[PDB]
Design a protein around this ligand. Structure first.
Ligand SMILES: CCCCCCCCCCCCCCCCCC(=O)O
Ligand SMILES: CCCCCCCCCCCCCCCCCC(=O)O
Lengths: 159, 159
């Protein structure tokens, strides 16, 4: 409920495939801090299920290694909002997407842990999708923001 | 030379006294990463010398402790640019200040390590000085940005 923006007319099937986590932002510094921080996650691919659920493939640093992760985001009544398994059932909200270039989403559990990403289809710095990410976030109370270069985008865990 | 903005008419005496590091930004993620990161420094006070040099009091996390530091920024021909001791003689540039509320500065060694801060006089979140900080930075190639709340501002090393 903290975020006042969701996409209308979302077709979840049409977000399937490859994405890059070009920018991330969060409400608290420590959510994004180190390579091992709790919401510091690098999206690899989205697989919508026929039921309209969302399989998410991602990377996360756990040892001093970049681990492979698989998560399922379950649908709700709202086409733009999903719930994750399971500890306090984390809500994922789709704010905006053109399916073909960018997607903006936020993850939350009006209090008040929040992380958001600007996803893009290709390993390039998209200024106008970053402008849209900054435009959507200037509302929210973010205290850390990270951006990645094309080199980092083609590496595991963006080193 | 990387930054295209400095303050004209700067009187270094009139920046003396108490400041808070409200926001920081940098060109590379790892410059600001953890509590121990190289340019992650919390400004406490500025003491201009009669010669027009600048004594800087600051905090930096070195052990798992917040250490007290003292540095001297030596003047140059340009009233807005100072050089620090001594390893590669780091240039500090004053971009803008109203002496009474905010100060924007950048620290650099056109390549291409760069960190900048929005300094303010009081432990409050100044939206219009943060707007000015974001306006001055949208030029520069920053990849990490951090913001602090009034609580953090009154603690050592902003915990
Ligand atoms: C549905 C359309 C957009 C989907 C975008 C992908 C959203 C990804 C949400 C992933 C959140 C996972 C939280 C962190 C889990 C990491 C596991 C861990 O805690 O170590
Ligand atoms: C002169 C007007 C504005 C002055 C603003 C203060 C600028 C502070 C510059 C300090 C840069 C120090 C670099 C990091 C030093 C920390 C020591 C270390 O490496 O452990």
């Amino acid at each position: 409920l903290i975020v006042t923006q969701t996409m209308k007319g979302l077709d979840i099937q049409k977000v399937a495939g490859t994405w890059y986590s070009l920018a991330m932002a969060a409400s608290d510094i420590s959510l994004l801090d180190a390579q091992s921080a709790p919401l510091r996650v690098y999206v690899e691919e989205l697989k919508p299920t026929p039921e309209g659920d969302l399989e998410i493939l991602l990377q996360k640093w756990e040892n001093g290694e970049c681990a492979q992760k698989k998560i399922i985001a379950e649908k709700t009544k709202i086409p733009a909002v999903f719930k994750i398994d399971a500890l306090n059932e984390n809500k994922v909200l789709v704010l905006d997407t053109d399916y073909k270039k960018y997607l903006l989403f936020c993850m939350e559990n009006p209090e008040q842990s929040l992380a958001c990403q600007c996803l893009v289809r290709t390993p390039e710095v998209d200024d106008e999708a970053l402008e849209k990410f900054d435009k959507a976030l200037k509302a929210l109370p973010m205290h850390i923001r990270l951006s990645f270069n094309p080199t980092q985008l083609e590496e595991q865990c963006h080193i």
